[PDB]
Design a protein around this ligand. Sequence first.
Ligand SMILES: [Cl-]
Ligand SMILES: [Cl-]
Ligand SMILES: [Mg+2]
Lengths: 354, 353
Amino acid sequence: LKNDRFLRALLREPVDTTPIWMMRQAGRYLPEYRETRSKAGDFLSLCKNTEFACEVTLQPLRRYDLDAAILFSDILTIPDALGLGLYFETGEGPKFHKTVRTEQDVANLPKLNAKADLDYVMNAVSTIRSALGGQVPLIGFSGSPWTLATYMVEGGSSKEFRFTKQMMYAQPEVLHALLDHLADSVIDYLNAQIDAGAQAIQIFDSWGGALAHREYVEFSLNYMKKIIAGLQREKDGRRIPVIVFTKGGGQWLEPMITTGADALGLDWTTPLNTARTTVAGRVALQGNLDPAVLYGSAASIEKAVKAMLDDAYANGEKTGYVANLGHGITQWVDPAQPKIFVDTVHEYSAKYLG
Amino acid sequence: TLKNDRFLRALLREPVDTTPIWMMRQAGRYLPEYRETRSKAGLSLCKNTEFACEVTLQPLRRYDLDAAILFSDILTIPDALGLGLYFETGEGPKFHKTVRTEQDVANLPKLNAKADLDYVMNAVSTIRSALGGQVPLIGFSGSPWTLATYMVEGGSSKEFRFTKQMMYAQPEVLHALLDHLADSVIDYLNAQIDAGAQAIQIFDSWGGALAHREYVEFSLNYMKKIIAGLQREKDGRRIPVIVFTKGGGQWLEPMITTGADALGLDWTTPLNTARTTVAGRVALQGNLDPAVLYGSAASIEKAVKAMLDDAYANGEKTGYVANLGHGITQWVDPAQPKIFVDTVHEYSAKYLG
Ligand SMILES: [Cl-]
Ligand SMILES: [Cl-]
Ligand SMILES: [Mg+2]
């Protein structure tokens, strides 16, 4: 690796400057993404299109001095591979032809053979890893068991999680069986991504923030802890750092540390300075800028990013922080603006580092 | 006279005989009698004082609740300001006109709450009479930030694209909008008090979308301004004020500076740590996930007991009102809130005698 500052920061090793990458850094806000996307087919076939996947993964790296690439894929690969039939309904988002509702439904789920069933994901990982030429590390990822379960039980996107929470409170042993199946699936999936070339791992618990605080531990967190216990710790003489991210989970930092994750993701509602003092060097932190900050002027973005770094380094620490947004880049962002974000993070860091 | 005022006492950290309880959206679609009354109404609901009064009373006939809440909508204010409220099937509330520019803000009219929203005041006074002192009546408003999101986006929103764009690109324009709304809400809430409201809740339903410093600047400070302008007492009783920012649990210490008597909590916030943090400086209201009511009777009783255990773990014997952490859903079985209410009242004896 010519550049490994991202990995060093996550592992709380000395770094020359603050690393940065951006969730959804490959996406519609880029004209070249849309142009590439138009040559492709249906929205479902994008992830299975290895050429497309590799191409759009590389595009933000050509524009911005990012310190990591992330696999272009979808968390919903796993429930599709488990046979629930993913499709997209314009314009209501992802849906499934089958839902999981009963004890027997859960028992009937097939075991995921990720290397075979999701071979197209592994081909993307390996192809991207080759294309990167060691320039920056590659992040592999999965949805969390709770977050994947919501799609499988609701049958798609959900604002209230009516059926999954009904299962949680009325049939908890059924939901636990589903979550356990998914934890094993995610272990297989992530380890296969590592085998294929992933150098860091992020678990996206996108809907864990919907849970009541005790239920977050029982029905989401404990299953992420199980996953991490099953992952390869190292590959090619290097630690593989793991990031856990539960958006809206800022009140639950202390439980999150018990997952054994190297790093925790934060959104904009969490003060970075108090999160840093609270975790006290026990884990690294990633985040946490509101993407809408990038709707402001160049000058305002610069000021906002400096303030965020001030919060990150107020406690005197010189590592353990990766700058990022608190959610994905929106499709409305002016492609000039993330450059301000990246360059300011790298340059202003000299105030605190070295 | 109030035959039952334990809700008001708890909000004011005064001694109570048992834990008070009411439920957000306790009048709503989950009740078959609501659906029947609603089918006879065909917004018209909110402007029909007879309808509004009737559905407000329905949950009180069914459950031993300790408060009634005015049946209305937070969006009465932007409708009265002329943005054209309507409801799209399966999509929620919408406005024909949106606020996007400095000129749009300048063009907003001054609200005369008692006249422009006379139907709200008539509902408040009619409900107050119909209650015959049974329980206190809660009046309410949306917060300036939360009202602003609907006015700028033009309806419900997942990302708040245009409101946050305005916040970061044109903060002076958003501040002017928020200030106009703060003045409007002061007049609206004071008019509800004049009409008979005995407690006030400010619903900052989308304040949890804000970055932490922006919560203070663009939501909290405007709720602080509102509370400073409210009538404090009427008819020999204090009028307690509740501030509720769903998703705002990380911000309890700043929230105290609103001057509110009580803060609402959702299910993501541990009640025991919240109680320790506020340390008797405000009352707390909440915080059950309404989906708990999807479980068995036995499981509801267990869950509610655990919640009260959290509320009273610190040995503090007042300053707590039980509630959900959000509105009751349309899918709840009407049998289930009775278990919630009765367990709250009975189990409290463990801590309150
Ligand atoms: Cl991402
Ligand atoms: Cl309500
Ligand atoms: Mg004006």
